[PDB]
Here is the input.
Amino acid sequence: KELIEYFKSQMKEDPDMASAVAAIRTLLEFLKRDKGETIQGLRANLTSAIETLCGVDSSVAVSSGGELFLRFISLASLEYSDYSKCKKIMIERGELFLRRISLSRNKIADLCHTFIKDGATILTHAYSRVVLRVLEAAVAAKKRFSVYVTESQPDLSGKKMAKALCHLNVPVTVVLDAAVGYIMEKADLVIVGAEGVVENGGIINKIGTNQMAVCAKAQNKPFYVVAESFKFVRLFPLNQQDVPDKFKYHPWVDYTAPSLITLLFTDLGVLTPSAVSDELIKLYL
Amino acid sequence: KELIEYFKSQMKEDPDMASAVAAIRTLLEFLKRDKGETIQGLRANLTSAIETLCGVDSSVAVSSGGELFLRFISLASLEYSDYSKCKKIMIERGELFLRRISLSRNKIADLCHTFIKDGATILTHAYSRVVLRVLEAAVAAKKRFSVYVTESQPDLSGKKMAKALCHLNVPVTVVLDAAVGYIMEKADLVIVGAEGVVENGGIINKIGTNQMAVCAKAQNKPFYVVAESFKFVRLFPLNQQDVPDKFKYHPWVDYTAPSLITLLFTDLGVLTPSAVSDELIKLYL
Amino acid sequence: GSELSERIESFVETLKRGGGPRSSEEMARETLGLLRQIITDHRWSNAGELMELIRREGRRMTAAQPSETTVGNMVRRVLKIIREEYGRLHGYAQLQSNIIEAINELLVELEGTMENIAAQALEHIHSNEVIMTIGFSRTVEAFLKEAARKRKFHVIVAECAPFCQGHEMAVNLSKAGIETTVMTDAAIFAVMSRVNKVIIGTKTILANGALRAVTGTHTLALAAKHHSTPLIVCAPMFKLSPQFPNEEDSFHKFVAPEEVLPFTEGDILEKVSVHCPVFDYVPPELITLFISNIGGNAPSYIYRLMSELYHPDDHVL
Here is the structure.
């Protein structure tokens, strides 16, 4: 399996790189190395590549990125009639799409950091480069705030987040995993980076997120979520058990309703949680 | 310090014994070994013994038991005029009070276990003998239910609770400390044993309790609290920071409001959270 | 040239000193007239030069008064109009007449917004109803005064504590005979147990569905969310702005504190700190429905109007 080896080589070469962007790069490399002059024959190989990537990586981000890449390939196949020009058109469009996606973290950084006030108290979940990027953009604009980071009991990455953020010389405090209702009264705003955004506006994320969002509702604190465009997935979990079991594995994942989420931050803007439904039904699966 | 040595000998001889009952036994032993014929001279020595017990034991239960024993000694001093008969009267009354307190776990067991339905899903916090007693009384009445126990990240006692409960041959599952909002939809009722009950009806307990009670309010599950009479304390924390710092020490303690608590279970009965105010102002500090 | 400069400077000074003119519709009309007057007498080769020129004058107009963003979002609307016209002409000399007729039909749309709100007002008022209103605006006053032409209902007018502007609205509604009851802003939760629905207006609708309005309506919306009564914001489309709430902390417009504590109080005025914010912030979760001239919209739909009237490039102006 050269696809899993190329995905591991793309994800292990840069520790500050996401997994969904490496999955999209692996799918573009597989589409470049396929060279099959068939409409459904390329779609079946793409679906096999997405299934092989989802069998290795148990994240929702790679599955949503594969679904968006399959919708993009279907749009490129429905736009152009002949396949010979459509292959090069899809290759150039995928290169431009990867170029637009690679600059989205700068968009989150310069778009979301204006919400943090001076002397504020940020509450932060486990390690993600989006929250670290928006926090270094906040301290790049000469802002002072106290950060409370969740220790992230399954994989000790909130401790890794605090170790990466203390080298940035900011006041960072590791709080206990069962203490997000204790420090909700002192944290005036909470920013939690998500790894998957469902259609109605809720987020699929790590297991300690949703209860904190419940603590964001009984204590009326604004629950802010930073997530890029490739983390949009056309799913609707009704309860915490309606998420697929391939993303669960002591669960590693949960679901947060859009009623408990105040605002979303994507490269298309600072947007209401009702807007991801608009983008997902304007993208048409 | 013979008082701390006697308290350690009373608490270490029985692992299924609480700390507040050992503090009350140590206070009765100190009152028996004092032999000081003075009203305020015995009260100052009792206050010094309570301060020495609270300097060693950082729990709220020993402080509330010391406060109730000091109120009991003040009542015995205000009832009888002469001190020579009042010393023996207080000794006999303390012996009868310890006899009444020692049978209170049977009262909780035969009084609270009728609320658990068949095929239910109990959610349980860290290790306490009250919840284990009411669960063994529930399985003594031929009841079947699934137990979800919090792992208790600071001191691994929820794992010890599951190890003590799996020898009882009941279906027990260790759930993650950040997953009490994930399993709230399947747990139809939640029972959390407390270590300190404040005047308005809230409870002072371990750090993972209160947010679960928040999950008991947004998901309307009945939050049941089992606590005995010696855990009543005449304090009023406004927020999570208004608890005293001597009971905090990464905090180890929180506070749950009486609005998020459905029912209380004491040896005086199954009682509304507004009733502990009645007992505390009928006891007059 | 000279006439343009003196009219622009007079506009900047009359926006800097006080409220001139009074209502938002006539100042939106004179802002559109100022924009058409500054585009008919200029010379440009590319549309980006006119974009930067309109951007500089809009920066000056928001520097004149930051809390008054009607001129800013109308400058942004003209910017999106010239952007879509350059986009539809790019895919070269007839663009100016297109922007003039676009501004003309925008003025026709702006003249008939209150009559459209009054036309769609009939499906929101039933007989023997009670109505709560805070502050004063001609939109909700015209709303109620024509909705009482066929319905019999009651209007509760709560006055505003900085400026008692509810009094002229109460005597204007009582001339139409709507059985209006005047009260303070102090018994709102004391009257919220009987209020069926609350018809209010606003000063500025934000991008996330939130709104700034006259002060005391965040408390009123909290009481309406406590009693689960529907909140109806009758606001036109020129009060819609992309300015986010947490943006440089220049949200409220603070005015002189004599209306709160007068100057004849005594020696205690030195050791006291009296603030008077005339505007207040209401989150979108306390709003149920907005009413504009095109109809009713959810607070979870305002972003689409943000995608239909404004461009995300022109948010910084």
Summary: Chain B has ten helices and ten strands. The first strand of chain B starts at residue 120 and ends at 124. The beta strands of chain B are 120-124, 145-150, 172-175, 189-193, 196-197, 203-205, 223-226, 254-256, 263-266, 269-271. Chain B has two domains: 2-107, 108-283.
